[PDB]
Amino acid sequence: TALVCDNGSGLVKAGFAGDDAPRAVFPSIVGRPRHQGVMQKDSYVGDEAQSKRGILTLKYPIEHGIITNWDDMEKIWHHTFYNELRVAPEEHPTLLTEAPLNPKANREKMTQIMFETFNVPAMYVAIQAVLSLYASGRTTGIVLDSGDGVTHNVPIYEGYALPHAIMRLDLAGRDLTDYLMKILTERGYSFVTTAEREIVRDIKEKLCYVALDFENEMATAASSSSLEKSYELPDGQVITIGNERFRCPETLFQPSFIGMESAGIHETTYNSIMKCDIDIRKDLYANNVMSGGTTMYPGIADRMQKEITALAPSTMKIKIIAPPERKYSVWIGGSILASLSTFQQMWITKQEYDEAGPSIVHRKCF
Amino acid sequence: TALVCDNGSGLVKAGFAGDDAPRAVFPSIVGRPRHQGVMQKDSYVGDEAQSKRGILTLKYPIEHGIITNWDDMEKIWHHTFYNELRVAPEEHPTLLTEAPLNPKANREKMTQIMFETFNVPAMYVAIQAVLSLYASGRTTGIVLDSGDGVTHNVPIYEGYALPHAIMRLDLAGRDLTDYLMKILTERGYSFVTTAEREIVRDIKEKLCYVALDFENEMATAASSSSLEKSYELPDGQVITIGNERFRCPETLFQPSFIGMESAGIHETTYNSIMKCDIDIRKDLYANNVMSGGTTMYPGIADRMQKEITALAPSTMKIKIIAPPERKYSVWIGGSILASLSTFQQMWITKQEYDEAGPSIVHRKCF
Amino acid sequence: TALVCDNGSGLVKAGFAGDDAPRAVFPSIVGRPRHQGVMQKDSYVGDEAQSKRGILTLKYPIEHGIITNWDDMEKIWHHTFYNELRVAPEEHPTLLTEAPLNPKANREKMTQIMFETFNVPAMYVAIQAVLSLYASGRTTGIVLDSGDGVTHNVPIYEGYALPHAIMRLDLAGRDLTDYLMKILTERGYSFVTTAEREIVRDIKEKLCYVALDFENEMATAASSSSLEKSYELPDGQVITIGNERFRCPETLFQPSFIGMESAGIHETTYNSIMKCDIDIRKDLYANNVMSGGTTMYPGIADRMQKEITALAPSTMKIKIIAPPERKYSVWIGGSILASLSTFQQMWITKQEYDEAGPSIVHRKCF
Amino acid sequence: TALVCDNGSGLVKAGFAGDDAPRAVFPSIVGRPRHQGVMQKDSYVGDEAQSKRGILTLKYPIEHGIITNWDDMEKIWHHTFYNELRVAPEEHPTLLTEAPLNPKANREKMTQIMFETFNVPAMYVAIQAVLSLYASGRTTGIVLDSGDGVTHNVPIYEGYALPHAIMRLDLAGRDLTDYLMKILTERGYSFVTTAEREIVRDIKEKLCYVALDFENEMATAASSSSLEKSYELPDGQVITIGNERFRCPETLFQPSFIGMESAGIHETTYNSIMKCDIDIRKDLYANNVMSGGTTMYPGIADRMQKEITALAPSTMKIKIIAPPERKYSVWIGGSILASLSTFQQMWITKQEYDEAGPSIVHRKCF
Amino acid sequence: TALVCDNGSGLVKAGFAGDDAPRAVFPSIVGRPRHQGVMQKDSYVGDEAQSKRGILTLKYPIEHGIITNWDDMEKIWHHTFYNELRVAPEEHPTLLTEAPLNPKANREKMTQIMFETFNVPAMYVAIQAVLSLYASGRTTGIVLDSGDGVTHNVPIYEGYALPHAIMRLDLAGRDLTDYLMKILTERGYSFVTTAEREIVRDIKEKLCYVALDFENEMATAASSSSLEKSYELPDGQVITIGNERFRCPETLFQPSFIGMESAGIHETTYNSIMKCDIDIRKDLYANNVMSGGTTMYPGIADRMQKEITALAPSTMKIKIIAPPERKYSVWIGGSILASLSTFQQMWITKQEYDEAGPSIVHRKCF
Ligand SMILES: Nc1ncnc2c1ncn2[C@@H]1O[C@H](COP(=O)(O)OP(=O)(O)O)[C@@H](O)[C@H]1O
Ligand SMILES: Nc1ncnc2c1ncn2[C@@H]1O[C@H](COP(=O)(O)OP(=O)(O)O)[C@@H](O)[C@H]1O
Ligand SMILES: Nc1ncnc2c1ncn2[C@@H]1O[C@H](COP(=O)(O)OP(=O)(O)O)[C@@H](O)[C@H]1O
Ligand SMILES: Nc1ncnc2c1ncn2[C@@H]1O[C@H](COP(=O)(O)OP(=O)(O)O)[C@@H](O)[C@H]1O
Ligand SMILES: Nc1ncnc2c1ncn2[C@@H]1O[C@H](COP(=O)(O)OP(=O)(O)O)[C@@H](O)[C@H]1O
Ligand code: BEF
Ligand code: BEF
Ligand code: BEF
Ligand code: BEF
Ligand code: BEF
Ligand SMILES: [Mg+2]
Ligand SMILES: [Mg+2]
Ligand SMILES: [Mg+2]
Ligand SMILES: [Mg+2]
Ligand SMILES: [Mg+2]
């Protein structure tokens, strides 16, 4: 059986091809002690680093889909194979994922590590948005995947990708967390350390939602208090947040909140459709597929429906497809792809890698 | 029973001899993917290529009645026999059509393919304008056939053709479509790709008409807006066109609009009549038969009537015969001819082709 | 004296008729602050917007030769007359330029602004490729003008234009800049904002060249490092690019690199010649005139020479005329035309415009 | 004339707009007797509390730029207006200051007290780092202000602020004083009470300096005794300190000395520049403006110059601007701003406050 | 086997590593005759000085954890090795203890005496609060150790110490004894000499307790006499004390009783927890470990539980761990540490001390 590992900027999703859900889902963090030991491990990975985060400095080795710390990324892969899956890497072909429009050296160095450090028999690097379309059981649609580091649009029609219409935005979940940390100081709550950033991320996942009409929601939160909710910190302190609940996800539709010049995810989706041939736009309008953890905000599908309907012609039928399991769509699609009998010819074996060099990994890639 | 296949520059009309209408009518196009497949057929033909045209490059293998791409033309014949008619070619004699004054190698290579690739028992290549006269139930008349690639005049008197009065013009429907694409840029509408050319062709067939008086119509369209009509694009966008509706078909009467030096179809018809013997001109004036898709514009028979009346003597009775089914006149006439008991001696059998070479196909031909 | 203003998609070229070079050459941009002022002008134009681009959102009011933002285009004309030329518009007749096959409303609204906002005494809108032939001192030749927004071919023979052989391609310098931004992400360089697009444009103008043989050049850049060059960013960072230097201009000859279906500039030039009368093709083959900033790549004349020689008959003499000042050929030709005594009758005066309406501006136009 | 009051965490700087220096500079402390009176005022403020600190418990009402004790903060404002300036608050508009990223209720409650307790005619709360740029006579630069409670970086370019690049660190002078108290116990000196903390603060301001190379300085202080200096306590005891002189200010560059996870002021300045647009970084590198009392250590400008030069590209010109009067830069800039004729429209009058509520005070604020 | 010597300000605890209790526990006093001998030893140490205290002046060589009289401290170490343990110092490695935040010269001079006067083979100076956590069998908790001279809080999480949250208070048992001597004069009991201070210390250890509610206890002692207890002096006189029983230990929670400005041990514990990372506070709240003789008052754990519960959030579980043997926790923990096989590498041998100087003793120290 094959291994399917979706190495996100925020979460590692790993498991075996053929399963319906990832077996191991843990944060993609490496923690190191920042104080002084007197009574000890040198570094902690994943959920272990999360439970000891009070005395650790937490580091993400992947920033915006790009692996920045290769020594820490190797610890995460080692932790995934031996501690989470309890499997031998040299026995299973490994399907990895990557964001589109990544640097070419990122995929080449990832292939060298899988072949020379873990000695996998074969491997393959897929494009994440293509796997998301496999998970939804579709051959046509424009995928909006938004994770912790990358937001990208990839239109696909009848199984053919349109690489020249691919959009990529370096605004995702981690940028929303940093923005929530900033606007929480308006109420006197100060989250500074990397461990406290994990607390704000948990606040974001529990209380934040997307307002259908932002300016109408801002007036409601300013008049009454029915939108305010409480949250208990790990030390028992209770904080209360009001309009911060929908101001944080609003950055997805107004990236100028964090000083970015780019357009929101609704305009980016519409611009990607308008770059496609006029004869496929009707099918793309009816098959907007959302995937990734950042699409899990309550009300984001209704907001995307409203914003794209206002941009598209009135006779087009806009349909946002947001299944409940879309947070793992990339992994689920990779599990379906790695189980296809037609796919078994696309594995890049160790023998082919020794005779073709690193350039063999850049095929069917964009 | 015999097969009747009218392979036009734009449409394939195929069916069985004895029927009243073609069984299979589909565009004579071959489409190939122009992007990149990630999730597939290599090429699509006819209506299948039309429905997937958003991700295809569309190619017409026939240009101006002349087969240019023989590999693609073979795919269209294969698609016609096995996908559209669901018939075995080696069981039916096949009546094919051709425009007059075509290159001799076009008919010879078409005969070699029918005998050696499809192994038809017998075949025959008829002249299209002669079949149009069969469809109208006439033995005398001058036929003006205008399709997608060729416009030609053929006078026939009491069953005798006058080959030396045959006119041929390489201005037809596809040239009007390209001209409509050009003058639509005046309103800011940009159709460039081969898939968008199919959209303009649909605009032409829905909204374009022939003005009875062109300069009087240009003044009306410049003064008011009663001639403007809207059209909804496949993606929901609505375009509005005014004088482009009658400027496009006006090219048939003023070929200088597209830079051609030739005379319009009315002058070409009159010149063909004036090259005929003076004793048959009265019968030709009263039997102007129009056929083909490009004669389907509203008001073209009234315009032809007016233009030829102004050229002919005042005592001649000009009569334009334009039946409602004239878009399939060539096929209907070929269905009548292939069902005649007198015609059964004109079949070129496979045995006669092996003993006489390709030169046997050039009999009763011009 | 007359004003000659070449309003390109990328650069404004303005000056006085009779001069040898434009007096004012500045980018056709309008910048507006995108942050928040605390210590201010509302908008900046041209070189002023270029020097402050770090805190501005830069907007081009002309896209593909078509004016899209008329309020911003009016700011550019105002900046041209009063800040760059320091002249009174109501004292000089103004010769403007336009790309062929533009929407008719573009030229009409441009005439209304010049007569009612700036109150010019007279004006005239010339066709750019015709002016390029004036600059080269020729009466016969096929002009390939490629600027920031439009690439077009216009054949002219003995002073007569052939409008039905005019080609227009919406692929020019700005599309090459966007493609260079895309393929620079392969090396981990991320240019996203409109200000960073100006940096990539500067990279393109300094380092990009046209390879004589593309596939042979790709093998050289993949084997060694002699083609790699460094470039210092405004903040002191040094980037290094290799095959991106010739992959970006290769899009001119292979528009499928950016997903366009059209043919390259060499095939478009050859197709335009083949649409012309056979008796003028020999003179067009020997007078290929290149103009515009996008024809300034090193090696593009040698590549065009090689590609057209491979398409034309072996006995034809292909000659590419590429003078060193061809980046301003449209302006230089407009300066020659506006100084001709024969041209002084073609000025459209304010009095003629009030009595003939906007339709007077569509004369000698295509 | 207007009042300019810079209420710092450590010092109150108050005076009149138009002057060159604050008229009243006193510690922002409230002292209350902690023993028992037998022979009396209930509380002492400022320099009076400083001279009687032996029998007082000293309290700072402002912690890390945030007013914590509003009853004590009201005593300080009352002491400022009536005892230090000898002025009537209801006759002068008052310009107050605040650190960026403060809680919103801090500025709202400060406005309510100025309007309802002191009945000022108008008021305005400025951002401190913006005023520091006014004092230096610049429109572009990144300000590093470090006082007693807050250290913050604010980049400004051509008069436009970049709020999304603003850094704030809760490490300043009071944290260095507490760290000096801790490391003085290594030599057997025990400072515990709030009155003795004022003695350590005086030691810090007299003897502490920033080492150019910390590890090289630690080796010199460990080998000889040329770095040791003596200090006479208020009771005549003489203490001698060696490497504590530069270990205390080193916390600014290594916040891990006091257990903070954040980066030093040099890395924070460089990170703030790298978050800004690439086109403004060159101007920010050349205009590093330092302000506040914590930037008054000898050798801190040379150390900042060295640390940022090691982080920035080698071709950038790093220039630290540290004027001798930078300890009062916020007040001096507020004195310049309150004297501008353009600023007289930004006063928030008492009438506007009664009709717009407390929300009017959050304009041009971050 | 190793020697474990806990040299407190009040008691010497000495024994061998591996044992469960100290073998020698005696007061850390040196007594010298203060009258005139007529019928004799020059000085007495420990229990011998205690039994002859009537004719001696008693001196403590350690004040507030700091060795003040080095000649007398050497007599105590000599008495410990040769009279109490009857052991040869040059045969056993010696584990010594020290309070945190002590002067550096205290530990250096103690190391020089152990190596040059007693010629121990190896030695090590541990931090007392860390040893207290070893004794309780915990890896996480905040230790409140209160002896005769020093009270300090040290939080430890999962074996990692947080030195920047360490509190130290120079208020312990000897200050409570001096306060009891003062308030006993209210009943006419006069204890003045150093020998009578030992009697008051015995009164404190027998009769003093911590009141759960101080003001409610003061009302009970003022209304009735059920809280009064008698104590027989060495000469047969019987004294009776009432509210002095709980007023003396109340100084631990209200240090202002003896004129100290610091906060009580409950506020100091809570402040130390609040300086720690928010993610470890829940574990520190549940693991408050008390050690030392001054934590042996009846009712001090219930009072600490009540005071910290009133400061902490209501959802936190406050748990005070006070084992019955906590008066020797530092020694018991040092006996466990010196018996660990992992610790045998941390011994500072005499050879390492001769080659590294006194600076080797400051490792893993704060
Ligand atoms: N219920 C939720 N609501 C909002 N955001 C969520 C939710 N669950 C997860 N996220 C966000 O999704 C991001 C990561 O999701 P994922 O798609 O796994 O990203 P990646 O694949 O890049 O690691 C995190 O930043 C997290 O904050
Ligand atoms: N209703 C219509 N009005 C105008 N043109 C039409 C109409 N229907 C078909 N056509 C044109 O007729 C042309 C093809 O007709 P046809 O006679 O089948 O040509 P061919 O036989 O050469 O394929 C096409 O170019 C199409 O645009
Ligand atoms: N040396 C050069 N090499 C390549 N491209 C260039 C060079 N100089 C200018 N260009 C390109 O030419 C384009 C604009 O030239 P121009 O002919 O003025 O266009 P327009 O007239 O449409 O404004 C710009 O996109 C610019 O990038
Ligand atoms: N010469 C000096 N050297 C070092 N630190 C100084 C000096 N003078 C003042 N300080 C420190 O500056 C801090 C306060 O300066 P200031 O900028 O007024 O802060 P705030 O505005 O927050 O009150 C105090 O903590 C003080 O210790
Ligand atoms: N039962 C008790 N109740 C109250 N205090 C006690 C009791 N037993 C001992 N003490 C006090 O504990 C102090 C010394 O204990 P210890 O922890 O050994 O201190 P050190 O280690 O500093 O010598 C003495 O001041 C003594 O008065
Ligand atoms: F890396 Be995640 F998918 F943004
Ligand atoms: F080929 Be069609 F009949 F013009
Ligand atoms: F507008 Be440029 F001439 F392409
Ligand atoms: F409050 Be100070 F300016 F740090
Ligand atoms: F010296 Be004791 F432990 F207070
Ligand atoms: Mg992902
Ligand atoms: Mg036909
Ligand atoms: Mg141009
Ligand atoms: Mg300040
Ligand atoms: Mg002790």
Author numbering:
A (entry chain C), B (entry chain E), C (entry chain D), D (entry chain B), E (entry chain A): 6 to 44, 49 to 375
Q: Would you copy out the relevant sentences from the publication that reported this structure?
A:
Many processes driven by actin, such as cell division, depend on its ATPase activity. Here we present 6 cryo-electron microscopy (cryo-EM) structures of rabbit skeletal α-actin filaments at approximately 2.2 Å resolution in 3 functional states, polymerized in the presence of Mg2+ or Ca2+. After the exit of Pi, ADP-bound F-actin represents the ‘aged’ state of the filament, which can then be depolymerized back to G-actin. By contrast, our structures are remarkably similar in all solved nucleotide states, showing that ADP-F-actin should not be regarded as destabilized but rather as a ‘primed state’, which exhibits faster depolymerization rates at the filament ends and is sensitive to cofilin binding and severing due to the absence of the γ-phosphate moiety.
We solved F-actin structures using ADP complexed with beryllium fluoride (BeF3−, also referred to as BeFx)29 to mimic the short-lived ATP state of the filament. In the Mg2+-ADP-BeF3− F-actin structure (2.17 Å), we observed unambiguous density for the modelling of ADP-BeF3− in the nucleotide-binding site. Notably, the nucleotide conformation of Mg2+-ADP-BeF3− in F-actin resembled Mg2+-ATP in G-actin, confirming the suitability of ADP-BeF3− as ATP mimic. In Mg2+-ADP-BeF3− F-actin, Mg2+ is coordinated by Pβ of ADP, a fluoride moiety of BeF3− and four water molecules, defining a hexa-coordinated, octahedral coordination, similar to that of Mg2+ in ATP-G-actin. As no other ordered water molecules align in front of the nucleotide, the water molecule that is hydrogen-bonded to Q137 is likely to represent the nucleophile (Wnuc) that hydrolyses ATP in F-actin. The O–Be–Wnuc angle in the structure is 144°, whereas an angle of >150° is required for efficient nucleophilic attack. Although it cannot be excluded that nucleotide orientation is slightly altered between ADP-BeF3−-bound and ATP-bound F-actin, inspection of the reconstruction showed that the density for Wnuc is extended, indicating that the position of Wnuc is not fixed, allowing it to move into a position that brings the O–Be–Wnuc angle >150° while remaining hydrogen-bonded to Q137. In the Mg2+-ADP-BeF3− F-actin structure, we could separate two intrastrand conformations through a focused classification approach. The first conformation (about 37% of the particles, 2.32 Å resolution) represents the open D-loop, where the D-loop bends outwardly and interacts with the extended C terminus of the adjacent actin subunit. In the second conformation (about 63% of the particles, 2.32 Å resolution), the C terminus remains extended but turns away from the inwardly folded, closed D-loop.
